[PDB]
């Protein structure tokens, strides 16, 4: 049973802790936790290719994609709090789609997931728990 | 798989960026960079087991050791800056001794105490 964690931090007040759990390699990964500092509403949620935070989230590179790193959206409540509880079957804590050592980021805007009719607030490197 | 980077940050003034490169699987890992904010002298330099920074360096766990994570000491000069240039053949960016996703920490006292700064080691390439 592999487990991962990510502390999200930015220049603003955005911050959170995200947990990852995968009990079977090639099984689904459960991701859960909370993020604070958000404007209420839908915020894009992505794993980026590089665990490079030398320039904050700016150095994280592209959406991870061996998108595979597309985890959808999170939703902030009126205290700007977002409870995250996701189960993703595309990402992984091992092998080919492993996300350990990569960057997690919550985006300013919602991710319309390509179905829209046509700044990165915080980030952290995904580490072993 | 072949390069890693780690931003070291703590509560105090210690901060740095550290690089890792391994172009051959299971080959020696080259580690280099600088750290500033240190008292002049010898400071312990280790990889700790968890990439868990939920409590700063406090949640980082024990020295990584399935020590494998011991990288020796860095040495701060009179301006409190330590230039690092190390070659370690025990750590790796893959396999059993993979340090990617784990925590790098520089310690208060020398390694013949309090963790001054830490960071999660991430993929740079």
From Swiss-Prot, chain A:
Reaction it catalyzes: 2 superoxide + 2 H(+) = H2O2 + O2
Outcome reported for the amino acid change (mutating residue 77 to A): In ALS1; does not seem to be linked with a decrease in activity
Effect of residue 6 to S: Enhances formation of fibrillar aggregates in the absence of bound zinc
Effect on the protein of changing residue 46 to R: In ALS1; 80% of wild-type activity; ubiquitinated by RNF19A
Residues carrying Phosphoserine: 85, 89, 92, 94
Positions that bind Zn(2+): 63, 67, 70
GO cellular component: axon cytoplasm; cytoplasm; cytoplasmic vesicle; cytosol; dendrite cytoplasm; dense core granule; extracellular exosome; extracellular region
Keywords: Acetylation, Amyotrophic lateral sclerosis, Antioxidant, Copper, Cytoplasm, Disease variant, Disulfide bond, Lipoprotein, Metal-binding, Neurodegeneration, Nucleus, Oxidoreductase, Palmitate, Phosphoprotein, Ubl conjugation, Zinc
Outcome when changing residue 67 to A: Loss of zinc binding and enhanced tendency to form aggregates
Modification type N6-acetyllysine: residues: 109
Cofactor(s) this protein requires: Cu cation; Zn(2+)
Subcellular location as annotated: Cytoplasm; Nucleus
GO MF annotation terms: copper ion binding; identical protein binding; protein homodimerization activity; protein phosphatase 2B binding; protein-folding chaperone binding; small GTPase binding; superoxide dismutase activity; zinc ion binding
Keyword Transmembrane set for record: no
Modified residues (N-acetylalanine): 1
Cysteine-cysteine disulfides: 57-123
Gene3D superfamilies (alphabetical): Superoxide dismutase, copper/zinc binding domain
Cofactor binding description: Binds 1 copper ion per subunit.
Result of altering residue 70 to A: Loss of zinc binding and enhanced tendency to form aggregates
Post-translational modification: The ditryptophan cross-link at Trp-32 is responsible for the non-disulfide-linked homodimerization. Such modification might only occur in extreme conditions and additional experimental evidence is required. Palmitoylation helps nuclear targeting and decreases catalytic activity.
Top-tier EC class: oxidoreductase
GO biological process: action potential initiation; anterograde axonal transport; apoptotic process; auditory receptor cell stereocilium organization; cellular response to ATP; cellular response to cadmium ion; cellular response to potassium ion; determination of adult lifespan
InterPro entries in the cross-refs: SOD-like_Cu/Zn_dom_sf, SOD_Cu/Zn_/chaperone, SOD_Cu/Zn_BS, SOD_Cu_Zn_dom
Disease: Amyotrophic lateral sclerosis 1: A neurodegenerative disorder affecting upper motor neurons in the brain and lower motor neurons in the brain stem and spinal cord, resulting in fatal paralysis. Sensory abnormalities are absent. The pathologic hallmarks of the disease include pallor of the corticospinal tract due to loss of motor neurons, presence of ubiquitin-positive inclusions within surviving motor neurons, and deposition of pathologic aggregates. The etiology of amyotrophic lateral sclerosis is likely to be multifactorial, involving both genetic and environmental factors. Spastic tetraplegia and axial hypotonia, progressive: An autosomal recessive, neurologic disorder characterized by loss of motor abilities in the first year of life, after which severe, progressive spastic tetraparesis develops. Affected individuals have severe axial hypotonia, hyperekplexia, hypertonia, and myokymia, reflecting upper motor neuron involvement. Cognitive development may be affected.
Other observations noted: The protein (both wild-type and ALS1 variants) has a tendency to form fibrillar aggregates in the absence of the intramolecular disulfide bond or of bound zinc ions. These aggregates may have cytotoxic effects. Zinc binding promotes dimerization and stabilizes the native form.
Protein name: Superoxide dismutase [Cu-Zn]
Annotated source species: Homo sapiens
């Amino acid at each position: 049973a592999t487990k991962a964690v990510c502390v999200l931090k930015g220049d603003g007040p955005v911050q959170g802790i995200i947990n990852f759990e995968q009990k079977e390699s090639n099984g689904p990964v459960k991701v859960w936790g909370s993020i604070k500092g958000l404007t209420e509403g839908l915020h894009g949620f992505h794993v980026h290719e590089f665990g490079d935070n030398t320039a904050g989230s700016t150095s994280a590179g592209p959406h991870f994609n061996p998108h595979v790193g597309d985890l959808g959206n999170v939703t902030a409540d009126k205290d700007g709090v977002a409870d995250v509880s996701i189960e993703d079957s595309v990402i992984s804590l091992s092998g080919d789609h492993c996300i350990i050592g990569r960057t997690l980021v919550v985006h300013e805007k919602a991710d319309d997931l390509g179905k829209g009719g046509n700044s990165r607030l915080a980030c952290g490197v995904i580490g072993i728990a």
